[PDB]
């Protein structure tokens, strides 16, 4: 039990460890007796499980590599020095997003006051909280249905071959 | 924050009080990450209630999920809504028997 | 200025010089086969004789180069090179060290223009490799 | 013409050493660049250039030209 | 072979011996290991002639040694024997194509004996797939070609040494006994004349104590070690007596912890030294010990004996006393002297067979351990051998050796010479050897015993100088691992033709003559004073009465790569070393051309390397095409050979075999049918013959640079084809499997124009940086989107497909055609790894012409980067209007001391123009008339052997008797200099200039693969600095020295910005980029992340670090 | 001079056609030496069968 | 001997330090992102050898905590305490005392001290020398027509180093409408 | 090589946002440690917690 609970960095429940051990033992016995590497289907029919389960059990049991294993022949580099930080803020992307944010407001500027206001409140560009139609209509006092229609006309205007060019590139 | 302000850099001998004043919580299990969900395990070496959230402006369970809730301790899980870079700055501690 | 194998001119008086000293060398060797001297005396006498021969041949070569020679122009103007290399190319390469740092009494009497034999080339490889290794370790010692 | 001009000796005749000239020219160049960047706004802050320039000239070159011409002063604060 | 291309030779010494098979060094070892029919044929002929006697293959030896395996009760045993091999399951081509390992099954018949009832269960056992060696001495491991390099090690035995004691100026002597697979024991007579017997490097004990422990009384020691004073002094200063007391004292000394019993110490010592399982000096060790100490114990079994220890002590004490000779046990006489640990009497060679045998032995050790552990638990008589033998450790050991080992190296396939020289390599560093940084300066020197066993010129130039070398031309490895060399026997002063293979010690015994010594033509010496080698490698003059051996030929000491440099004796050793090291980097060109002037080794090297297709049996070419040759053998069978066309070598070059024979020609055995990567008609051809003039030209060849002509770009004289392979695989993920499809989510159809119906690029379609080769899509799942992007989607009404694109794109700065695509599907029976569902490989080829920045070189260590390419109309031209192809700087010749290149140029011009010297009754013309070099048609190749080439007198005479050109004028004067014109000005140059033909190589240091630049790219994880390398974008390093330089200048702001807003300041990089793009002032730097990481690392060590302000209050670092 | 070629069953230079003794890359070098003379300003086409 | 002792006894008498800081009661734990646990391509995971040491410490501590309150003889309790001390010692400095702890491949584990010492530590590899942006490298040839204050750069290297400046300039001249199109034009290598 | 810590990020800032309301609830320890905790107004208050000083209920 202790070896099942304190033997892997990424812990696995007891039953899954038992299944892994059973599969490994069966594979070893098949390899020894038959003289070749068993195929996934052979183990699947021997273990009475689908091949997908067999490959999943094979995958779960692997041991993580170490980031400190040296790969430099002279002994200076490490395996972990060549891993790229994928979730790293790329300055080009950040500047592109900032430019998009600044350009979006200008296109709304040419629209009428009510149109830009209702669009901003609905999509929460100014504050980030998308308010409900009743909330938007409370400020101007117009009806819910009016808020429904006024928004649609703005989308039709922007989704036209007259103001799309300024915003086509960013998509 | 400003290098110009740095006047001196002192070293010392950390005592128990300092060691548990740095820490944001005790680590009391040897687990790191779930083998199926691949998310940090509670009270493990990678816990989020101690070392901070792993998603910008989000908590573990997910009730609070945007910037508007900033600096709020979720009662369901205890994680505070803040950036994920704070995982580079928060320590823990182990209480030896 | 150009380089051609006719520009590398060996002294005409070198040959006789060497032959002269060669005879002298032979005498000493005979005295060793007769038991009148010990090994150290023979080695020291041969080294002295061949040092004298090397210096004399170097003087002859220095006196033989004309002023308008391309190689003498390279050396004289200070563009590139010195006199030891130009003595090795046209003259006598001299005495060489052993695997252990100690002079070999038998010299190299052929320059790179005339071409070395097999044993002479093998003897020179010793010093070549020692110099290369010395450079290799100096590179790091200086940095430290 | 280019990085070579204006001659360094003429510049050093107007200052104490190279170390002060570096700071002096850099500060003037920052002033010129700041003036250019916020030119769209109607603003009264920063001044220059005080010499005839090109279509797109590096502000550091203009700063060095003004320093050589003798149109600037340096004080100690 | 008789069907070799014509090449006139200037050699004047007739050789009596041909060069051996250059690849035997590895094929013979592996044949011995396996026990093939070839090894049986060799050993059969060995009987009654020579010594190739070893009658047991490696595997047979291991199986015989390991068996029998017996229980403690001894009632039952298991034995192996009679190993066998089966034909391989796959061919070489299939293994290289599908990434399999070339090997064969191994079977061993095992008997299963029971002492009760006389049981026997003789049955077959499958011991695994043993890798095999191809016909070219290379292994095919995981689809890649690999080479195992022999190892130079210190042979086991007994070694005596003496040094000087610094304090007292007194000699101190020591004597070690070092076995293979065992412990060490070393005696030493210290400054006080006391004799220590240090055991397993455990402090120090008196040798008298050991003698007492072994069962020697005081009287025997006194009577035997009587004449000497060290032994008496040690014996008196002992204060101990009794075998049991001494044995207990030894136990207390070596292994403290318990009060021991006399029986524990006895078995401890027996297991430490006298037990064969834990201690075994091999055959070589026993042989060396017998030679040194005079003992004549049999070589069959190796284990230390008390007689050996006593003899070692006697030898050491006699050496210390000052006696120079002794009468060894069971012998006549022996010399008492110290040993040199670098002599090839003490350094041996572990070849591929021995290394693989060691690995197999290590595997079988654990195999038998498991077998004996399992034997007891299971019930007796109810078992069969198949239930006992577990073959996992053996295969694990083999696969661990052939991967991630220093001696099994990626093969180097630039050209045939490089591949051949990768073999025949002796490496002194590796597992069990000595490490790079620890070697002194005595193991990196040219010992006088290297003559004919190891090349003194060909070695690396980096920090491996002296630790790696190449076997000589005639070198042959003894059965014990020592290298031999052949010598011609000379008797009565007459040089007979009998040849004897001699090793280092026997060589030291005799006196050896010189290869190129005057002979009367009666096989007798004429000078009456010959320069010879003596015992200590000392050269000395001796009369032709004492010489008893001679060299078989000159160039017996030089390797194969160094034997291809014409006029070697005229070059300095350093420049020759660089030239030999640089001849292995030449790239194969699209059109090969054999050297105009060379040595006689090109044909032999090209054919023996194995890169030239050769006929197997004589016949007539029946059918022929660029892809194959079908030959109708005389015996009645037909055989078809397939030629490699535009393959890819390990280094990325192109392997392409041309055809030589015609549709009607008759072929004999061994004849050449198809060339190789860099061979021309069956002989090596690495470069081109270019017309060269030595002169400084307008400073464009200043300081080793090179000026080329445009004719070498017009005619593809130096063009080469390079190939690269790109891989991409589709696997499983959490959100379903990835897919290789043409439906990339958001890209114009124009990009998806050359893609095939499967989403893979089409053959024959050119690509440039940015194009997609394979279209791949990976599902990403639902994610939260920023308000601006949501509004943009609402405006345009698009829908997130839930899948992103991860296609394969050509790297930055790459171009070329598409040669082929190969796709593996896991569901099609392909053996993809676990978790991979599909894989695909794309091959991209391109032809590169010579351009400035590329590096050229010659055979004499004269390299340089092309820095100019002039038009054809402004190169200097000879009197008849022929421009020169390359201009070199004269200043580099005299200072570097390599006059060989000038001679090569003169002889190249002579060979190109051809000569006719038949009627001249001149002294030099007589020699040519005796070697058939009278008339030579223009363009004919010539040969100048290494140390037996062409004398300058012959060249000077020949320069007056060439063939006049169409105008009846010889353009090159008898001084070797020609009158050139000026290409630009037009006025003739004031003085004549040297001109001729040089053989120029193209090195694999192209500038295309050297250039990289970055402005922003990937960053590392822990510390946020730019990533390093060139596969990525990569940033250049700013080390300590550059920081010191900037500090010395006084530049503080530049240093601050380099160290902060370019490497570590995470929030400053994006702000700097934004400021640059928007055109405003760069912001102030922050604080680097590395400092914060350092502070956290120190705080984790319970160190209370804290940064203070102008007053004493912590800043908290955010 | 000849400025381009196309063969019936060939896609690129680095391949060989059935029934010939030479590669396409070694045939381009042979047709690079053709000494042709043309009188047409525009490109002209020739056929080899 | 007294002088050497007084060199140490006096340090704690004057400064604010106390000797009690030489014996620990709680062990700090480094933040997770300085010992990352990355998922490579294909599901393979990579660790940093500090997770293993922390896990050893925590396992030994928890087992000791269970043993103490369970009630056990002094032998096993003392053995557990010795193991805990050895685990902490291996965490801080590995191989200083006894034999180093090893992992797969038979290589010593990297401890906290090993990250500061040596030619490959923080001090000498990351703080005094760094990798930098806006930098290129290439082989040099000779140009004799240049002046003493000039150099020649290949246009690929020049365009790569000066990408942001070029983008700004060709957005300024109206050759491009925005940064995105300017970046696309620069990457694809147009003529202007 | 490619690798990714299991961390998500968003292109989003702190400037120009209005924070939601919160309430500070006070908790006390046995030894006298007191602390405050911010919770959303639309939240339930649990009866028990862990201390911010000595890690006790
Ligand atoms: Zn929550």
**What's C96's domain CATH number?**
1.10.132.30
- The secondary element (H helix, E strand) that includes residue E1060 is helix E1052-1060
Which residues touch E925 (CB under 8 Å, ≥6 apart)?
Answer: E917, E957
What gap in Å lies between CA E160 and CA F9, rounded to an integer? 76
- What are the tokens at A148? 């429904």
- What are the tokens at H8? 């998500």
Q: Across the interface, do E792 and A170 touch by the CB < 8 Å criterion?
A: yes
Helices E37-46 and E24-34 pack at an angle, to 10 degrees, of 100
Q: Is H2 on the interface with A (CB under 8 A)?
A: yes
Per-position DSSP letters for E903-949, written without gaps between them: HHHHHHHHHHH-EE-SS---HHHHHHHTTT-SEE-TT--EE--SSS-
Q: What is the largest CA-CA distance in chain E?
A: 113
Share in percent of chain D as helix, strand, coil (round to 5): 45, 0, 55
Beta-bridge partner residues of E642: E628
Helix (H, G, I), strand (E, B) or coil at E542: strand
CB–CB of B51/B22 below 8 Å?
no
Domain range holding C53? Answer: 13-133
Q: Are strands E69-70 and E8-9 parallel, antiparallel or unpaired?
A: unpaired
Summarize the annotated binding site of B for Zn(2+) as residue ranges: 59, 61, 74, 77
Is the backbone peptide bond immediately before E505 cis, with ω within 30 degrees of 0?
Answer: no
- What are the tokens at A168? 């086509």
Q: Is H5 on the interface with G (CB under 8 A)?
A: yes
**Among residues E172, E646, G138, which one has the least CA distance to residue F11?**
E646
Query: How many residue pairs from chains A and H have C-beta atoms closer than 8 A?
Result: 24
CB–CB of E684/E843 below 8 Å?
no
Resolution in angstroms comes to: 3.2
- What are the tokens at C95? 């005495």
- Binding-face residues of G in 128-157 toward D, CB within 8 A: 147, 149
CB–CB of A69/A79 below 8 Å?
yes
Q: What's the CA angle centered on E401, arms E395 and E405, to 5 degrees?
A: 160
**Among residues E190, E210, E228, which one has the least CA distance to residue E309?**
E210
Beta-bridge partner residues of E76: E114
Please identify which residue in the block is written with the tokens 């070849």: E351
Helix (H, G, I), strand (E, B) or coil at E826: helix
- Looking at chain G, the number of H-run helices and the number of E-run strands are 6, 5
Instruction: Tell me the HSE value of E166 on the side-chain side, using a 13 A CA sphere.
Output: 0
CB–CB of E178/E346 below 8 Å?
no
Residue E831's Cα: distance from chain center in Å?
32
Q: What's the CA angle centered on E1034, arms E1031 and E1036, to 5 degrees?
A: 130
Residue-level length of chain D: 77
**Among residues C117, C123, C61, C115, which one has the least CA distance to residue C86?**
C61
Asked whether residue C74 is assigned to any structural domain, the reply reads yes
CB–CB of H26/B55 below 8 Å?
no
Share in percent of chain A as helix, strand, coil (round to 5): 60, 0, 35
CB–CB of E309/E287 below 8 Å?
no
What gap in Å lies between CA E1070 and CA E1019, rounded to an integer? 13
- What are the tokens at E361? 């032995």
* C-alpha separations of E1074 from A93, E1054, E1079, E1082 in Å: 11, 20, 8, 9
Asked whether residue C82 is assigned to any structural domain, the reply reads yes
Q: Is E656 on the interface with F (CB under 8 A)?
A: yes
Plot region of G56 (φ>0 → left; ψ -120 to 50 → alpha; else → beta): alpha
Helix (H, G, I), strand (E, B) or coil at E44: helix
DSSP E480: S
Least CB–CB distance from G128: residue in E813, E1010, E1043 = E1043
Please identify which residue in the block is written with the tokens 């001196």: B8
Per-position DSSP letters for E514-528, written without gaps between them: -SS--B-SSSBB-SS
Beta-bridge partner residues of D75: none
Asked whether residue C64 is assigned to any structural domain, the reply reads yes
* C-alpha separations of E968 from B14, E880, E971 in Å: 98, 11, 10
Q: What's the CA angle centered on A120, arms A114 and A124, to 5 degrees?
A: 150
What Rg value do the Cα atoms of chain E yield, rounded? 37
- What are the tokens at H1? 């090589």
CB–CB of F12/E846 below 8 Å?
no
Tell me if H33 is assigned to a ligand binding site.
yes
What gap in Å lies between CA C72 and CA A163, rounded to an integer? 81
Asked whether residue C144 is assigned to any structural domain, the reply reads no
**Among residues B79, B95, B87, which one has the least CA distance to residue B51?**
B87
Tell me if H49 is assigned to a ligand binding site.
no
Residue-level length of chain E: 1118
Helices G179-188 and A91-109 pack at an angle, to 10 degrees, of 140
User: Residue D55: closest CA among chain G residues belongs to which residue?
Assistant: G173
Contacts of A83 in chain E (CB under 8 A): 1020-1021
Please identify which residue in the block is written with the tokens 């400025």: F3
Residue-level length of chain A: 171
Hey, CA dihedral for B53, B59, B65, B70, is it positive or negative?
negative
Taking the CA of residue H42 and the nearest CA in chain G, the distance in Å comes to 32
Please identify which residue in the block is written with the tokens 């202007």: G192
What Rg value do the Cα atoms of chain G yield, rounded? 29
**Among residues E854, E850, E851, E868, which one has the least CA distance to residue E698?**
E868
Q: Across the interface, do B11 and E1105 touch by the CB < 8 Å criterion?
A: yes
Asked whether residue C6 is assigned to any structural domain, the reply reads no
What Rg value do the Cα atoms of chain H yield, rounded? 18
Contacts of G34 in chain E (CB under 8 A): 1022, 1093, 1096-1097
What gap in Å lies between CA B23 and CA B50, rounded to an integer? 8
What gap in Å lies between CA E185 and CA E129, rounded to an integer? 40
- What are the tokens at G15? 């400064």
CB–CB of E825/E737 below 8 Å?
no
- What are the tokens at A150? 């006024």
Instruction: Write phi, then psi, for E597 (nearest 5 degrees).
Output: -125, 125
Least CB–CB distance from A128: residue in B31, B34, B68 = B68
- The secondary element (H helix, E strand) that includes residue E672 is strand E672-674
Helices D59-69 and D18-37 pack at an angle, to 10 degrees, of 120
Which ranges of C8-117 does DSSP label H, i.e. alpha helix?
Answer: 14-33, 39-64, 70-76, 83-89
**Among residues E652, E637, E674, E569, which one has the least CA distance to residue E904?**
E569
Q: Which of F6, F7, F11, F14 to mutate to test the interface with E (most CBs of E within 10 A)?
A: F14
User: Subunits that touch chain E (at least 3 Cβ pairs < 8 angstroms)?
Assistant: A, B, C, D, F, G, H
What gap in Å lies between CA E899 and CA C88, rounded to an integer? 11
| Experimental determination approach used | cryo-EM
What gap in Å lies between CA C52 and CA C113, rounded to an integer? 22
E736 burial class (0-12, 13-18, 19+ CB within 10 angstroms)?
Answer: exposed
- What are the tokens at E500? 């004897």
CB–CB of E668/E619 below 8 Å?
no
Instruction: Tell me the HSE value of E1050 on the side-chain side, using a 13 A CA sphere.
Output: 7
* C-alpha separations of E378 from E393, E753, E947 in Å: 21, 69, 72
What gap in Å lies between CA C138 and CA C133, rounded to an integer? 9
* C-alpha separations of E1040 from A17, C140, E1098, E1107, G136 in Å: 51, 15, 23, 25, 19
CB–CB of E482/E156 below 8 Å?
no
Q: Is G57 on the interface with B (CB under 8 A)?
A: yes
Residue E87's Cα: distance from chain center in Å?
30
Beta-bridge partner residues of E78: E69, E112
Least CB–CB distance from C117: residue in E516, E695, E890 = E516
Beta-bridge partner residues of G39: G45, H4
Asked whether residue C59 is assigned to any structural domain, the reply reads yes
Helix (H, G, I), strand (E, B) or coil at G4: helix
Please identify which residue in the block is written with the tokens 């409408």: G177
Beta-bridge partner residues of E724: E844
The count of domains in chain C is 1
Q: Is E1048 on the interface with D (CB under 8 A)?
A: no
CB–CB of E910/E962 below 8 Å?
yes
Q: How far apart are the first and last CA of chain G?
A: 80
Beta-bridge partner residues of E158: E177
CB-CB neighbours of E772 under 10 Å:
22
CB–CB of G49/G109 below 8 Å?
yes
CB–CB of E1087/E1107 below 8 Å?
no
CB–CB of E888/E706 below 8 Å?
yes
- What are the tokens at E128? 């695994």
Helices A113-123 and A91-109 pack at an angle, to 10 degrees, of 140
- Looking at chain A, the number of H-run helices and the number of E-run strands are 9, 2
Three-state SS string over chain G comes to CHHHHHHHHHHHHHCCCCHHHHCCCEEEECCHHHCCCEEECCCCEEECCHHHHHHHHHHHHHHHHHHHHHCCCHHHHHHHHHHHHHHHHHHHCCCCCCCCCECCCCCECCCCHHHCCCCCCHHHHHHCCEECCCEEECCCCCCCCCCCCCCCCCHHHHHHHCHHHHHHHHHHCCCCCCHHHHHHHHHHCCCC
Q: Which of C84, C115, C130, C132 to mutate to test the interface with E (most CBs of E within 10 A)?
A: C115
Asked whether residue C69 is assigned to any structural domain, the reply reads yes
- What are the tokens at E189? 């007579």
**Among residues E566, E538, E582, which one has the least CA distance to residue E11?**
E566
What gap in Å lies between CA E1015 and CA B69, rounded to an integer? 37
Three-state SS string over E709-740 comes to ECHHHHCCCCCEEEEEEEEEEEEEECCEECEE
Asked whether residue C5 is assigned to any structural domain, the reply reads no
Tell how far the Cα of H39 is from the centroid of ligand 1, in angstroms: 11
Instruction: Write phi, then psi, for A5 (nearest 5 degrees).
Output: -95, -20
Please identify which residue in the block is written with the tokens 């997908």: A52
Is the backbone peptide bond immediately before E68 cis, with ω within 30 degrees of 0?
Answer: yes
What gap in Å lies between CA G56 and CA E176, rounded to an integer? 44
Hey, CA dihedral for G4, G5, G11, G17, is it positive or negative?
positive
- What are the tokens at G3? 């002088």
CB–CB of E1099/B92 below 8 Å?
no
CB–CB of B19/H55 below 8 Å?
no
Contacts of A67 in chain G (CB under 8 A): 36, 38, 46-49
DSSP G122: I
What gap in Å lies between CA H56 and CA H40, rounded to an integer? 24
**Among residues E400, E420, E343, which one has the least CA distance to residue E157?**
E343
Contacts of C71 in chain E (CB under 8 A): 894
Q: Across the interface, do E1105 and B91 touch by the CB < 8 Å criterion?
A: no
**How does E806-835 read in b/e, with b if 16+ C-beta sit within 10 Å?**
ebbebeeebebbbbbbeebebeeeeebeeb
């Amino acid at each position: 039990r202790a070896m099942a609970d304190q033997a892997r960095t990424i812990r696995i429940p007891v039953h899954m460890v038992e299944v892994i051990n059973k599969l490994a033992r069966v594979q070893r016995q098949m390899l020894q007796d038959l003289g070749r590497e068993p195929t996934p289907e052979e183990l699947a029919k021997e273990l009475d499980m689908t091949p997908e389960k067999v490959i999943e059990v094979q995958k779960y049991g692997r041991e993580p590599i170490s980031l400190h294993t040296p790969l430099g022949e002279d002994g200076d580099s490490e395996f972990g020095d060549l891993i790229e930080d994928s979730e790293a803020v790329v300055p080009a992307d950040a500047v592109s997003f900032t430019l998009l944010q600044e350009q979006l407001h200008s296109v709304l500027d040419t629209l009428s006051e009510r149109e830009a206001g209702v669009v901003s409140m609905r999509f929460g560009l100014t504050d980030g909280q998308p308010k409900t139609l009743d909330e938007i209509g409370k400020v101007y006092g117009v009806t819910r249905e009016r808020i429904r229609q006024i928004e649609s006309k703005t989308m039709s205007k922007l989704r036209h071959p007259s103001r799309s060019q300024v915003l086509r590139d960013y998509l | 924050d400003d290098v110009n302000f740095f006047d001196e850099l002192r070293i010392g001998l950390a005592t128990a009080d300092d060691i548990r004043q740095w820490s944001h919580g005790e680590v009391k299990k040897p687990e790191t990450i779930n083998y199926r969900t691949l998310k940090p395990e509670k009270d493990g070496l990678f816990c989020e209630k101690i070392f901070g959230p792993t998603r910008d402006w989000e908590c573990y369970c997910g009730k609070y999920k945007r910037v508007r809730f900033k600096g709020i301790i979720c009662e369901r899980c205890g994680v505070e809504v803040t950036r994920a870079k704070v995982r580079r700055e928060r320590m823990g501690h182990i209480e030896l028997a | 200025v150009t380089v051609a194998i006719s520009d590398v001119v060996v002294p005409e008086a070198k040959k006789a010089i060497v032959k002269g000293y060669e005879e002298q060398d032979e005498k000493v060797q005979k005295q060793y086969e007769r038991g009148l001297i010990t090994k150290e005396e023979r080695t020291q006498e041969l080294i002295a004789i061949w040092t004298k021969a090397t210096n004399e041949v170097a003087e002859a070569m220095n006196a033989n180069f004309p002023k308008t020679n391309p190689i003498f122009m390279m050396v004289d103007s200070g563009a590139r090179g010195n006199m030891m290399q130009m003595r090795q190319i046209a003259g006598m390469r001299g005495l060489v060290s052993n695997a252990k740092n100690e002079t070999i009494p038998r010299p190299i009497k052929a320059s790179f223009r005339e071409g070395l034999t097999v044993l002479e080339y093998f003897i020179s490889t010793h010093g070549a490799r020692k110099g290369l290794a010395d450079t290799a370790l100096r590179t790091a010692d200086s940095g430290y | 013409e280019g990085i070579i001009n204006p001659p360094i000796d003429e510049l050093l005749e107007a200052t104490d050493s190279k170390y002060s000239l570096v700071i002096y020219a850099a500060k003037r160049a920052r002033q010129i660049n700041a003036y250019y960047s916020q030119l769209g706004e109607g603003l009264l802050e920063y001044v220059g250039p005080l010499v005839d320039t090109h279509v797109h000239e590096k502000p550091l070159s203009i700063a060095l030209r003004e320093i050589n011409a003798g149109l600037l002063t340096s004080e100690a604060i | 072979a008789s069907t070799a291309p014509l090449r006139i030779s200037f050699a004047k010494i007739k050789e009596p011996l041909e060069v051996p098979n250059l690849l035997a060094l590895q094929t013979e070892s592996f044949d011995w290991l396996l026990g093939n029919a070839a090894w049986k044929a060799r050993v059969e002929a060995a009987l009654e002639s020579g010594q190739d006697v070893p009658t047991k293959s490696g595997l047979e030896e291991i199986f015989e040694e390991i068996s029998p395996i017996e229980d403690f009760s001894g009632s039952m045993s298991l034995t192996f024997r009679d190993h066998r091999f089966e034909p391989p399951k796959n061919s070489i081509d299939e293994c290289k194509d599908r990434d399999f390992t070339y090997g064969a099954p191994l079977f061993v018949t095992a008997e299963f004996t029971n002492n009760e009832t006389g049981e026997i269960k003789s049955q077959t056992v499958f011991m695994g797939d043993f890798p095999l060696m191809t016909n070219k001495g290379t292994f095919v491991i995981n689809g890649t070609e690999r080479v195992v390099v022999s190892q130079l090690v210190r042979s086991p035995g007994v070694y005596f040494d003496s040094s000087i004691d610094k304090t007292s100026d007194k000699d101190i002597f020591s004597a070690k006994i070092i076995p293979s697979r065992g412990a060490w024991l070393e005696m030493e007579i210290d400054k006080r004349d006391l004799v220590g017997v240090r055991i397993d490097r455990k402090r120090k004990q008196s040798v008298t104590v050991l003698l007492k422990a072994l069962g020697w009384t005081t009287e025997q020691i006194l009577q035997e070690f009587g004449e000497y004073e060290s032994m008496r002094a040690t014996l008196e200063k002992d204060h101990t007596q009794g075998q049991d007391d001494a044995l207990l004292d030894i136990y207390r000394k070596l292994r403290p912890g318990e009060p021991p019993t006399r029986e524990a110490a006895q078995t401890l010592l027996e297991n430490l030294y006298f037990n064969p399982k834990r201690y075994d000096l091999a055959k070589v060790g026993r042989y060396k010990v017998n030679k040194k100490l005079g003992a004549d114990e049999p070589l069959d079994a190796g284990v230390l004996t008390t007689d050996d220890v006593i003899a070692t002590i006697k030898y050491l004490v006699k050496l210390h006393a000052g006696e120079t000779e002794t009468i060894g046990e069971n012998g006549n006489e022996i010399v008492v002297e110290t040993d040199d640990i670098d002599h090839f009497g003490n350094r041996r060679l572990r070849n591929v067979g021995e290394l693989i045998q060691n690995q197999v032995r290590t595997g079988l050790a654990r195999m038998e351990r498991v077998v004996r552990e399992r034997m007891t638990t299971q019930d007796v008589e109810a078992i069969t051998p198949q239930t006992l033998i577990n073959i996992r450790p053996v295969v694990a050991s083999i696969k661990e050796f052939f991967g991630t080992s220093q001696l099994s190296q990626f093969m180097d396939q630039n050209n045939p010479l490089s591949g051949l020289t990768h073999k025949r390599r002796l490496s002194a560093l590796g597992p069990g050897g000595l490490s790079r940084e620890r070697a002194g300066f005595e193991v990196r020197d040219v010992h006088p015993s290297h003559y004919g066993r190891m090349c003194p010129i060909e070695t690396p130039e980096g920090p491996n100088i002296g630790l790696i070398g190449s076997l000589a031309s005639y070198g042959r490895v003894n059965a014990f691992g020592f290298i031999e060399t052949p010598y011609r026997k000379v008797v009565d002063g007459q040089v007979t033709d009998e040849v004897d293979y001699v090793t280092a010690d026997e060589e030291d015994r005799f006196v050896i003559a010189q290869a190129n010594a005057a002979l009367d033509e009666e096989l007798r010496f004429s000078e009456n004073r010959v320069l010879v080698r003596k015992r200590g490698g000392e050269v000395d003059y001796v009369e032709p009465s004492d010489v008893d051996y001679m060299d078989v030929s000159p160039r017996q000491m030089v390797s194969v790569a160094t034997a291809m440099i014409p006029f070697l004796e005229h070059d300095d050793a350093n420049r020759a070393l660089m030239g030999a090291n640089m001849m292995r980097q030449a790239v194969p060109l699209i059109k090969s051309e054999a050297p105009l002037v060379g040595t006689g080794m090109e044909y032999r090297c090209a054919t023996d390397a194995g890169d030239v297709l050769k006929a197997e049996k004589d016949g007539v070419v029946q059918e022929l095409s660029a892809d194959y040759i079908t030959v109708a053998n005389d015996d009645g069978t037909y055989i078809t050979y397939r030629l490699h066309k535009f393959s890819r070598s390990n280094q990325g070059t192109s392997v392409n075999q041309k055809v030589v024979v015609d549709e009607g020609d008759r072929v004999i055995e061994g004849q050449v049918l198809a060339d190789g990567p860099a061979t021309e008609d069956g002989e090596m051809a690495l470069g081109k013959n270019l017309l060269v003039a030595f002169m400084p030209w307008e400073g464009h060849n200043y300081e080793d640079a090179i000026i080329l002509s445009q004719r070498l770009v017009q005619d593809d004289v130096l063009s080469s084809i390079h190939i690269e392979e790109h891989e991409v695989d589709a696997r499983d993920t959490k959100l379903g499997p990835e897919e290789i499809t043409r439906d990339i989510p958001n890209v114009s159809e124009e990009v998806l124009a050359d893609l095939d119906e499967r989403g893979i690029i089409r053959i024959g379609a050119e690509v440039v940086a940015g194009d997609i080769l394979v279209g791949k899509v990976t599902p990403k799942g639902e994610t939260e989107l920023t308000p601006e992007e949501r509004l943009l989607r609402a405006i345009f009404g698009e829908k997130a497909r839930e899948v992103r694109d991860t296609s394969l794109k050509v790297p930055h700065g790459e171009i070329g055609k598409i040669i082929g695509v190969r796709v593996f599907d896991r569901e099609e029976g392909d053996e993809l790894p676990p978790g991979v569902n599909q894989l695909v490989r794309v091959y991209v080829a391109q032809k590169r012409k010579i351009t400035d920045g590329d590096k050229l070189a010659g055979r004499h260590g004269n390299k340089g980067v092309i820095s100019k390419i002039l038009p054809i109309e402004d190169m200097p031209f000879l009197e008849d209007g022929t421009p020169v192809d390359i201009i070199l700087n004269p200043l580099g010749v005299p200072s570097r001391m390599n006059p060989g290149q000038v001679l090569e140029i003169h002889l190249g011009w002579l060979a190109s123009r051809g000569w006719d010297v038949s009627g001249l009754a001149d002294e030099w013309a007589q020699r040519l008339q005796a070697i058939g070099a009278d008339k030579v048609a223009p363009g004919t190749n010539v040969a100048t052997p290494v140390f037996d080439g062409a004398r300058e007198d012959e060249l000077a005479g020949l320069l007056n008797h060439t063939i006049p050109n169409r105008d009846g004028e010889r353009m090159v004067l008898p001084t070797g200099k020609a009158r050139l014109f000026d290409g630009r000005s037009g006025e003739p140059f004031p003085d004549p200039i040297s001109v001729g033909y040089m053989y120029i190589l193209k090195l694999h240091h192209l500038v295309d693969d050297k250039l990289h630049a970055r402005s922003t790219g990937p960053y590392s994880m822990i510390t946020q600095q730019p990533l390093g390398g060139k596969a990525q974008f990569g940033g250049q390093r700013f080390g300590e020295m550059e920081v010191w330089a900037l500090e010395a200048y006084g530049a503080a702001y530049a240093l601050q910005e380099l160290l902060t807003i370019k490497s570590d300041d995470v929030t400053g990089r994006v702000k700097v980029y934004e400021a640059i793009v928007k055109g405003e002032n760069i912001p102030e730097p922050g604080i680097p992340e590395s400092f914060k990481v350092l502070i956290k690392e120190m705080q984790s060590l319970c160190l209370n670090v804290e940064v203070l302000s102008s007053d004493g209050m912590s800043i908290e670092m955010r | 001079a000849v400025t381009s070629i196309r063969i019936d069953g060939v896609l690129h230079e680095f391949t060989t056609v059935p029934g010939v003794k030479e590669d396409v890359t070694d045939l381009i070098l042979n047709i690079k030496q053709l000494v042709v003379s043309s009188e047409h300003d525009e490109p002209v086409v020739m056929y080899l069968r | 001997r007294a002088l050497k002792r007084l060199k140490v006894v006096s340090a704690f008498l004057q400064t604010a330090n106390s000797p009690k800081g030489m014996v620990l009661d709680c062990v700090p734990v480094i933040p997770p992102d300085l010992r990352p646990m990355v998922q490579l391509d294909g599901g393979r995971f990579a660790t940093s050898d500090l997770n293993d040491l922390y896990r050893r410490v925590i396992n030994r501590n928890n087992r000791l905590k269970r043993l103490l309150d369970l009630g056990a003889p002094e032998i096993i309790v003392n053995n557990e305490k010795r193991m805990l001390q050895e685990a902490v010692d291996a965490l801080f400095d590995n191989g200083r005392r006894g034999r180093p702890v090893t992992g797969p491949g038979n290589r010593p584990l990297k401890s906290l001290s090993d990250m500061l010492k040596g030619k490959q530590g923080r001090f000498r590899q990351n703080l005094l020398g760094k990798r930098v942006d806006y930098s290129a490298r290439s082989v040099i040839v000779v140009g004799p027509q240049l002046k003493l204050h000039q150099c020649g750069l290949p246009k690929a290297m020049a365009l790569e180093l000066f990408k942001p400046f070029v983008m700004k300039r060709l957005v300024d001249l109206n050759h491009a409408q925005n940064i995105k199109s300017a970046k696309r034009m620069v990457e694809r290598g147009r003529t202007v | 090589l490619r690798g990714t810590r299991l961390v998500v990020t968003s292109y989003e800032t702190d400037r120009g946002i209005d924070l939601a309301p919160r309430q500070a609830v006070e908790y006390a320890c046995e030894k006298g440690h007191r602390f405050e905790m911010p919770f959303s107004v639309e939240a339930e208050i649990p009866p028990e917690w862990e201390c911010k000083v000595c890690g006790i209920q």
